[PDB]
Write a protein that holds these residues in place. Structure first.
Motif, PDB file in Angstrom:
ATOM      1  N   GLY A  62      12.550  14.246  -2.422  1.00  0.00           N
ATOM      2  CA  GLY A  62      12.281  15.400  -1.586  1.00  0.00           C
ATOM      3  C   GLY A  62      10.798  15.715  -1.551  1.00  0.00           C
ATOM      4  O   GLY A  62      10.237  15.994  -0.491  1.00  0.00           O
ATOM      5  N   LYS A  63      10.170  15.680  -2.723  1.00  0.00           N
ATOM      6  CA  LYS A  63       8.742  15.944  -2.858  1.00  0.00           C
ATOM      7  C   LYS A  63       7.881  15.009  -2.007  1.00  0.00           C
ATOM      8  O   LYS A  63       6.836  15.409  -1.497  1.00  0.00           O
ATOM      9  N   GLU A  64       8.334  13.771  -1.842  1.00  0.00           N
ATOM     10  CA  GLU A  64       7.645  12.805  -0.991  1.00  0.00           C
ATOM     11  C   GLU A  64       7.746  13.174   0.484  1.00  0.00           C
ATOM     12  O   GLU A  64       6.781  13.030   1.234  1.00  0.00           O
ATOM     13  N   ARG A  65       8.917  13.651   0.894  1.00  0.00           N
ATOM     14  CA  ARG A  65       9.169  13.958   2.297  1.00  0.00           C
ATOM     15  C   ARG A  65       8.336  15.151   2.759  1.00  0.00           C
ATOM     16  O   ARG A  65       7.781  15.138   3.859  1.00  0.00           O
ATOM     17  N   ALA A  66       8.260  16.182   1.922  1.00  0.00           N
ATOM     18  CA  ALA A  66       7.428  17.344   2.217  1.00  0.00           C
ATOM     19  C   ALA A  66       5.974  16.909   2.355  1.00  0.00           C
ATOM     20  O   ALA A  66       5.245  17.392   3.224  1.00  0.00           O
ATOM     21  N   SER A  67       5.565  16.002   1.476  1.00  0.00           N
ATOM     22  CA  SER A  67       4.201  15.487   1.449  1.00  0.00           C
ATOM     23  C   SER A  67       3.832  14.836   2.777  1.00  0.00           C
ATOM     24  O   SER A  67       2.762  15.084   3.331  1.00  0.00           O
ATOM     25  N   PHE A  68       4.740  14.003   3.276  1.00  0.00           N
ATOM     26  CA  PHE A  68       4.531  13.276   4.523  1.00  0.00           C
ATOM     27  C   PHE A  68       4.439  14.190   5.739  1.00  0.00           C
ATOM     28  O   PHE A  68       3.621  13.959   6.629  1.00  0.00           O
ATOM     29  N   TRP A  69       5.276  15.220   5.782  1.00  0.00           N
ATOM     30  CA  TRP A  69       5.258  16.149   6.905  1.00  0.00           C
ATOM     31  C   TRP A  69       3.954  16.945   6.932  1.00  0.00           C
ATOM     32  O   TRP A  69       3.350  17.128   7.989  1.00  0.00           O
ATOM     33  N   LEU A  70       3.528  17.416   5.763  1.00  0.00           N
ATOM     34  CA  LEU A  70       2.230  18.066   5.618  1.00  0.00           C
ATOM     35  C   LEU A  70       1.083  17.101   5.918  1.00  0.00           C
ATOM     36  O   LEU A  70       0.054  17.497   6.464  1.00  0.00           O
ATOM     37  N   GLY A  71       1.271  15.838   5.548  1.00  0.00           N
ATOM     38  CA  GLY A  71       0.318  14.785   5.852  1.00  0.00           C
ATOM     39  C   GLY A  71       0.100  14.630   7.344  1.00  0.00           C
ATOM     40  O   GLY A  71      -1.034  14.626   7.824  1.00  0.00           O
ATOM     41  N   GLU A  72       1.202  14.507   8.074  1.00  0.00           N
ATOM     42  CA  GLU A  72       1.188  14.390   9.528  1.00  0.00           C
ATOM     43  C   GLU A  72       0.599  15.639  10.180  1.00  0.00           C
ATOM     44  O   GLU A  72       0.036  15.576  11.273  1.00  0.00           O
ATOM     45  N   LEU A  73       0.740  16.770   9.499  1.00  0.00           N
ATOM     46  CA  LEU A  73       0.163  18.034   9.947  1.00  0.00           C
ATOM     47  C   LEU A  73      -1.366  18.018   9.884  1.00  0.00           C
ATOM     48  O   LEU A  73      -2.030  18.487  10.811  1.00  0.00           O
ATOM     49  N   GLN A  74      -1.922  17.494   8.796  1.00  0.00           N
ATOM     50  CA  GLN A  74      -3.376  17.384   8.667  1.00  0.00           C
ATOM     51  C   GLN A  74      -3.975  16.456   9.718  1.00  0.00           C
ATOM     52  O   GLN A  74      -5.015  16.761  10.291  1.00  0.00           O
ATOM     53  N   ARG A  75      -3.326  15.324   9.963  1.00  0.00           N
ATOM     54  CA  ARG A  75      -3.799  14.384  10.976  1.00  0.00           C
ATOM     55  C   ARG A  75      -3.723  14.963  12.386  1.00  0.00           C
ATOM     56  O   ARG A  75      -4.503  14.581  13.258  1.00  0.00           O
ATOM     57  N   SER A  76      -2.784  15.875  12.613  1.00  0.00           N
ATOM     58  CA  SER A  76      -2.529  16.365  13.962  1.00  0.00           C
ATOM     59  C   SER A  76      -3.667  17.273  14.426  1.00  0.00           C
ATOM     60  O   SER A  76      -4.545  17.635  13.643  1.00  0.00           O
ATOM     61  N   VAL A  77      -3.637  17.641  15.702  1.00  0.00           N
ATOM     62  CA  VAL A  77      -4.643  18.519  16.294  1.00  0.00           C
ATOM     63  C   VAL A  77      -4.422  19.975  15.876  1.00  0.00           C
ATOM     64  O   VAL A  77      -5.350  20.785  15.862  1.00  0.00           O
ATOM     65  N   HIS A  78      -3.182  20.287  15.516  1.00  0.00           N
ATOM     66  CA  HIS A  78      -2.769  21.647  15.180  1.00  0.00           C
ATOM     67  C   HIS A  78      -3.306  22.145  13.834  1.00  0.00           C
ATOM     68  O   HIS A  78      -3.279  23.346  13.559  1.00  0.00           O
ATOM     69  N   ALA A  79      -3.775  21.217  13.005  1.00  0.00           N
ATOM     70  CA  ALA A  79      -4.278  21.515  11.660  1.00  0.00           C
ATOM     71  C   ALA A  79      -5.281  22.676  11.588  1.00  0.00           C
ATOM     72  O   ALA A  79      -5.172  23.535  10.713  1.00  0.00           O
ATOM     73  N   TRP A  80      -6.253  22.693  12.496  1.00  0.00           N
ATOM     74  CA  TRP A  80      -7.258  23.760  12.548  1.00  0.00           C
ATOM     75  C   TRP A  80      -6.663  25.163  12.644  1.00  0.00           C
ATOM     76  O   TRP A  80      -6.986  26.035  11.838  1.00  0.00           O
ATOM     77  N   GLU A  81      -5.804  25.377  13.634  1.00  0.00           N
ATOM     78  CA  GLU A  81      -5.243  26.699  13.892  1.00  0.00           C
ATOM     79  C   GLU A  81      -4.356  27.178  12.748  1.00  0.00           C
ATOM     80  O   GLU A  81      -4.431  28.338  12.344  1.00  0.00           O
ATOM     81  N   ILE A  82      -3.517  26.287  12.230  1.00  0.00           N
ATOM     82  CA  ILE A  82      -2.622  26.632  11.131  1.00  0.00           C
ATOM     83  C   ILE A  82      -3.384  27.018   9.861  1.00  0.00           C
ATOM     84  O   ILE A  82      -3.108  28.056   9.259  1.00  0.00           O
ATOM     85  N   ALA A 114       0.814  -1.210   0.000  1.00  0.00           N
ATOM     86  CA  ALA A 114       0.000   0.000   0.000  1.00  0.00           C
ATOM     87  C   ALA A 114       0.852   1.268   0.000  1.00  0.00           C
ATOM     88  O   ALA A 114       1.813   1.380   0.760  1.00  0.00           O
ATOM     89  N   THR A 115       0.491   2.216  -0.859  1.00  0.00           N
ATOM     90  CA  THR A 115       1.212   3.481  -0.971  1.00  0.00           C
ATOM     91  C   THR A 115       0.875   4.375   0.222  1.00  0.00           C
ATOM     92  O   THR A 115      -0.279   4.442   0.646  1.00  0.00           O
ATOM     93  N   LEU A 116       1.886   5.036   0.778  1.00  0.00           N
ATOM     94  CA  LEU A 116       1.675   5.936   1.907  1.00  0.00           C
ATOM     95  C   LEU A 116       1.587   7.383   1.444  1.00  0.00           C
ATOM     96  O   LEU A 116       2.606   8.033   1.216  1.00  0.00           O
ATOM     97  N   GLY A 117       0.362   7.882   1.309  1.00  0.00           N
ATOM     98  CA  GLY A 117       0.131   9.252   0.887  1.00  0.00           C
ATOM     99  C   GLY A 117       0.268   9.420  -0.613  1.00  0.00           C
ATOM    100  O   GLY A 117      -0.716   9.342  -1.351  1.00  0.00           O
ATOM    101  N   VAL A 118       1.494   9.649  -1.068  1.00  0.00           N
ATOM    102  CA  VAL A 118       1.759   9.840  -2.488  1.00  0.00           C
ATOM    103  C   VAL A 118       3.173   9.375  -2.813  1.00  0.00           C
ATOM    104  O   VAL A 118       4.050   9.368  -1.947  1.00  0.00           O
ATOM    105  N   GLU A 119       3.384   8.963  -4.057  1.00  0.00           N
ATOM    106  CA  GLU A 119       4.689   8.494  -4.494  1.00  0.00           C
ATOM    107  C   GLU A 119       5.010   9.023  -5.884  1.00  0.00           C
ATOM    108  O   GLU A 119       4.436   8.574  -6.875  1.00  0.00           O
ATOM    109  N   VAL A 120       5.940   9.969  -5.952  1.00  0.00           N
ATOM    110  CA  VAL A 120       6.262  10.642  -7.205  1.00  0.00           C
ATOM    111  C   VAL A 120       7.330   9.892  -7.991  1.00  0.00           C
ATOM    112  O   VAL A 120       8.394   9.572  -7.463  1.00  0.00           O
TER     113      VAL A 120
END
Ligand SMILES: Nc1nc2c(ncn2[C@@H]2O[C@H](COP(=O)(O)OP(=O)(O)OP(=O)(O)O)[C@@H](O)[C@H]2O)c(=O)[nH]1
Ligand SMILES: [Mg+2]
Lengths: 169, 871
Positions: free
Chosen positions: B22-42, A33-39
């Motif tokens: 790099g594009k994947e890593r930014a995606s994941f950090w923003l991803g974790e941001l949406q799941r977090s409680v802080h998402a609303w305020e930001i 399963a892909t985690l989020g997105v994969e470029v």
């Protein structure tokens, strides 16, 4: 010459497997399963210069959705993937389409019926209405047997560039 | 909470950094941001700051994604304040990118659907923004997506609350329609239609009110004006189709029905205007409107044809569309035709008119050089035509149409491209035509064989396929066998006609095998030089299959003689030596030569060397094992094969050895002479198998191995269970089975759930036989030891690991467990329910009651179903 391609569809439909077929040439049995997105940048050599596709392979499983809609920004084309062997995946095709056109309107979107190699087909190619409209197209594909596995990109290339004659080399 | 500087940074990477890693890593950090409680305020801050388009879309989207998933973590008091924010945001950003306006619109809709304290929300939104002309574009956007979001799988509103929602919207359906009139008085126009169309789709608009309303008149108005743009056109069309679709019963919606029926008929003129020009976008829309119209009033066309609603100009509009030179136009109507034929004398003339229209669409370009290609866009279309003709042919008469098509192929000196197309549709129906009226049927065949070689390649091609489809007429008229074969023999000897010929020959061989013994001499000679005809692998295999089907019907004396010759050409080629193709050709011979072990001896030594040379290559080995499978389908091969299997498998764990193993067990497992040897094979095969799965991600990386291993175990548990149960190896098999339950690979998981089910069922099945008590005890031991671990594992996979499609397989396993010891199971299940990480104790209790008290397996699956949803 590069294009942002968003790859969407239900989980287990064969999105990532399809890409790996082009990317490495290796068909892969496993399902991770892909985690989020994969470029993945996919470069095809054509009779009119090289074309690179920046494929955004998004996740189908709700748990690993990631940004989901956020991945769609400035997409120039898309591929909607569903399973030929799974009726519940085809039922969701309208929702995927609706999501893309809410972010990217009037972009070339290809519907892909994957796993057509399977003996007992549960989604008939006849019943599909997607390709009947234009800007939209359908292709029976199979990441295993490589049946029409290059059709979607070639078609998108002809649409993005704007040249009907264009061919892959 | 993260710093504001960081999120603006991560966003610019995700949207502009060309590197994939790099594009994947930014995606994941923003991803974790949406799941977090802080998402609303930001998100709220990002929209207020509104630096640029990138960050505002993310904040708006996140706003939407946090409302439709994380709505629960909002205090009731916060609701009113969040609503004011979003409305302020959409106001300020109203002239920003449109893709941002939608997300906010979606968010407000998703919020409203989940907020019962915001009653009369439709009223609130309109009378606040309807007078501001610049507010109107985003108000409509919200109003469009609101009914669409009522069936959102992302929101998944409860069944009762959902029903309330829909009828609440029905109450205000008047207010938006009223508004939608004020609105239109081009960009704005299409927004209105989409909004109208959307409320139509929900089925909450009043048919009687919309029947007499300017909006409807406006629809057909812009659909009539030639001057209207493509974007306004598509919107208008879609709204019309929505209007028609919303009519479920014409009688209940008769005012609306009559208005729409008459409305679309006025478009025939506009259709002709669009086809006079080269406006293909517009004509496709009209053809869509027409096809949708006929579907809605199909009943009236049938019940009271010609009169009123049954006005036969409907069918005519389609036949006009059917006449269009562009084939993308006619396939739109195919589904109606299917449906019309499905429901079905008045129509007969219409269907035969359609068939002639489709016949001409199959015509190739006069400058076409080769055969008709099936892979391309047009070859696909021809097949969709072929399938549609097959299903409608009964309305004309397969005798009436077949004859009629052939007759028109001599008048008017028909050009080659007109002949090919007629041959193609004839081939489409040549199978369904009854062989009772043989004379008209048998004279067509005589016409095809008298065709000269001079005719166009494509005509030769389709006529070969027509002959192929006419195999039942060669069976009832055995005299035509030799002429047909000879004609096909010519085509086979021509390179671009070879594949079509070989396919046609195979059909003949299969149906006309009863009296094919004479021609076998020829078939063998083709095989002897198969690779000269430049055939496709499929056509090659199909050819050899045919000759093997008639060889089995030959006299027993000549069988052993001719079979050995058929294989010798393959054996000699391998001996000289990628062997795949010859491996595949050997396999099909065995597969259909079913009247042999004498020939098997000649084959085995060369196969063993072939296998061993390419023992590293899975693809060749896989074809190798397929071949060996069919040769068996002869105990002299057993031990030398089992040995070689185990030795190769030892270094290369090809999972097809497991499957091949399962075949030997399925076929020789009942033979008690083999039961020991077979168990030895299993125990030997399991050692390198377990080594593979013991590795990290061992189950995920070799799902093929998991699948085939438990097919072997399953064959054991149904051919000789006791041999397996008293063994020691059954214990780690079961353990891995229990471990395999969390494997999300579908094929492999079905196999695992199958073994567990069949295993546990052995302690229940066939109590009539003597050895039942032994099997009963062996399973009882197993159930004692592992029973509690299985039930906990099965329950775990259902709630957290696997997709909903596994539930019937799990439920079936659970059912067998209750059959073995239900009172014990009741205890077991309580422990499984005990370890769970929410879910109320009441829910666990009544779940336990439903499952343990189930009398049918069906009841267990539903019980699991409801409970699974909770997770
Ligand atoms: N027979 C057959 N199986 C296929 C084919 N393509 C994919 N599969 C199977 O389907 C699975 C597809 O896995 P993925 O492509 O990673 O799943 P996905 O479509 O990316 O879904 P997500 O991971 O949620 O994004 C593979 O494990 C294959 O076993 C095919 O063309 N033919
Ligand atoms: Mg994936």
């Amino acid at each position: 010459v590069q294009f942002k391609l968003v790859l969407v569809g239900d989980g287990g439909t064969g999105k990532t497997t399809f890409v790996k077929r082009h990317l490495t040439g290796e068909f892969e049995k496993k399902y991770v399963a892909t985690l989020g997105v994969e470029v993945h940048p996919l470069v095809f050599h054509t009779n009119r210069g090289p074309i690179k596709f920046n494929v955004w392979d998004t996740a189908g499983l709700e748990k690993f959705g990631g940004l989901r809609d956020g991945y769609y920004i400035q997409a120039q084309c898309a591929i909607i993937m569903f399973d030929v062997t799974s009726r519940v995946t085809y039922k969701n095709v309208p929702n995927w389409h609706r999501d893309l056109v809410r972010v990217c309107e009037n972009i070339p979107i290809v519907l892909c019926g994957n796993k057509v190699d399977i003996k007992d087909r549960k989604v008939k190619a006849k019943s599909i209405v997607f390709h009947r409209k234009k800007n939209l197209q359908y292709y029976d594909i199979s990441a295993k047997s490589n049946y029409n596995f290059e059709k979607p990109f070639l078609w998108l290339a002809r649409k993005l560039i704007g040249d009907p004659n264009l061919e892959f080399v | 909470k993260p710093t504001l500087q960081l999120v603006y940074q991560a966003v610019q990477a995700l949207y502009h950094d060309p590197d994939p890693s790099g594009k994947e890593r930014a995606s994941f950090w923003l991803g974790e941001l949406q799941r977090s409680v802080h998402a609303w305020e930001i998100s709220d801050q990002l929209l207020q700051i509104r630096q640029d388009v990138e960050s505002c879309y993310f904040a708006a989207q996140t706003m939407k994604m946090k409302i439709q998933t994380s709505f629960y973590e909002l205090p009731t008091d916060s609701h009113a304040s969040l609503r004011d924010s979003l409305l302020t945001h959409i106001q300020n950003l109203k002239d920003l990118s449109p893709v941002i306006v939608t997300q906010l619109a979606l968010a407000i809709a998703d919020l409203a659907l989940q907020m019962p304290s915001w009653k009369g929300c439709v009223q609130t939104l309109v009378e606040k923004y309807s007078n501001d002309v610049t507010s109107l574009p985003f108000l409509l956007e919200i109003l469009t997506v609101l009914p669409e979001e009522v069936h959102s799988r992302s929101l998944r509103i409860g069944a009762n609350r959902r029903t309330e929602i829909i009828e609440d919207l029905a109450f205000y359906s008047s207010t938006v329609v009223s508004l939608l009139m004020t609105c239109v008085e081009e960009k704005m126009l299409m927004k209105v239609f989409r909004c109208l169309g959307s409320w139509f789709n929900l089925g909450v608009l009043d048919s009687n009110f919309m029947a007499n309303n300017k909006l409807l008149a406006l629809l057909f108005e812009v659909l009539q004006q030639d001057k209207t743009s493509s974007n306004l056109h598509e919107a208008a069309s879609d709204c019309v189709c929505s209007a028609l679709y919303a009519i479920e019963n014409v009688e209940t919606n008769l005012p609306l029905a009559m208005q729409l029926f008459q409305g679309v008929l006025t478009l025939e003129t506009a259709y002709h205007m669009a086809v006079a020009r080269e406006d293909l976008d517009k004509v496709l829309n009209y053809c869509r409107i027409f096809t949708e119209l006929c579907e809605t009033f199909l009943e009236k066309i049938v019940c009271t044809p010609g009169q009123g609603l049954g006005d036969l100009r409907t069918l005519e509009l389609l036949l006009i569309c059917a006449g269009h030179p562009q084939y993308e136009v006619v396939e739109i109507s195919f589904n109606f035709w299917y449906r019309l034929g499905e429901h079905l004398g008045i129509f007969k003339a219409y269907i035969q008119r359609l068939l002639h229209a489709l016949a001409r669409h199959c015509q190739l370009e006069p400058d076409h050089e080769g055969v008709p290609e099936e892979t391309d866009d047009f070859g696909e279309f021809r097949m969709r035509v072929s399938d549609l003709v097959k299903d409608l042919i009964f309305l004309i008469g397969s005798m009436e149409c077949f004859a009629q098509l052939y007759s028109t192929l001599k008048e008017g000196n028909p050009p080659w491209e007109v002949t090919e197309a007629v041959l193609f549709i004839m081939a489409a129906i040549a199978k369904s035509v009854d062989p009772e009226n043989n004379p008209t049927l048998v004279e067509v065949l005589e016409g095809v064989v008298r065709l000269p070689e001079t005719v166009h390649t494509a005509v030769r091609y389709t006529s070969i396929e027509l002959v192929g489809e006419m195999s039942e007429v060669v069976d009832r008229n055995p005299q035509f066998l030799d002429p047909v074969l000879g004609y096909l023999m010519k085509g086979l000897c021509e390179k671009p006609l070879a594949s079509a010929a070989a396919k046609a020959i195979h059909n003949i061989c299969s149906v006309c095998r009863d009296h094919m013994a004479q021609h076998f001499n020829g078939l063998l000679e083709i095989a002897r030089s198969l690779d000269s005809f430049l055939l496709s692998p499929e056509a090659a295999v199909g050819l050899l299959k045919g000759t093997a089907l008639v060889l089995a019907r030959l006299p027993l004396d000549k069988i052993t003689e001719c079979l050995s010759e058929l294989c010798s050409v393959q054996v000699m080629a391998l001996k000289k030596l990628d062997p795949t193709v010859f491996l595949d050709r050997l396999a099909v011979i065995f597969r259909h030569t079913n009247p042999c072990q004498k020939v098997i001896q000649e084959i085995w030594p060369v196969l063993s060397e072939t296998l061993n040379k390419h023992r590293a290559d899975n693809r060749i080995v896989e074809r190798c094992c397929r071949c060996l499978r069919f040769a068996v389908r002869s105990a002299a091969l057993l031990q030398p094969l089992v040995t070689q299997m185990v030795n190769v498998y030892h270094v290369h764990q090809h999972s097809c050895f497991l499957y091949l193993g399962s075949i030997l067990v399925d076929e020789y497992g009942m033979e008690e002479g083999c039961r020991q040897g077979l168990l030895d094979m299993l125990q030997a095969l399991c050692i390198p198998t377990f080594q593979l799965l013991e590795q990290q991600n061992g189950l995920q990386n070799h799902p093929d191995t998991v699948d085939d291993l438990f097919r072997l175990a399953t064959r054991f548990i149904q051919r000789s269970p006791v041999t397996l149960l008293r063994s020691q190896v059954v214990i780690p098999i079961l353990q891995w089975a229990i471990a395999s339950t969390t494997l999300d690979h579908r094929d492999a998981n079905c196999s695992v759930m199958r073994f567990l089910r069949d295993l546990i069922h052995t302690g229940v099945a066939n109590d009539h036989e003597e050895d039942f008590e032994l099997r009963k005890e062996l399973i009882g031991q197993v159930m004692n030891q592992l029973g509690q671990q299985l039930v906990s594992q099965l329950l775990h996979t259902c709630c957290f690991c696997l997709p909903p499609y596994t539930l019937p397989d799990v439920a079936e396993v659970l059912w067998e467990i209750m059959q073995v010891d239900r009172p014990t199971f009741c205890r077991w299940l309580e422990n499984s329910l005990k370890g769970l990480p929410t879910v109320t104790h009441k829910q666990l209790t009544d779940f336990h009651k439903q499952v343990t008290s189930a009398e049918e397996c069906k009841q267990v699956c539903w019980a699991l179903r409801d409970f699974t949803r909770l997770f």
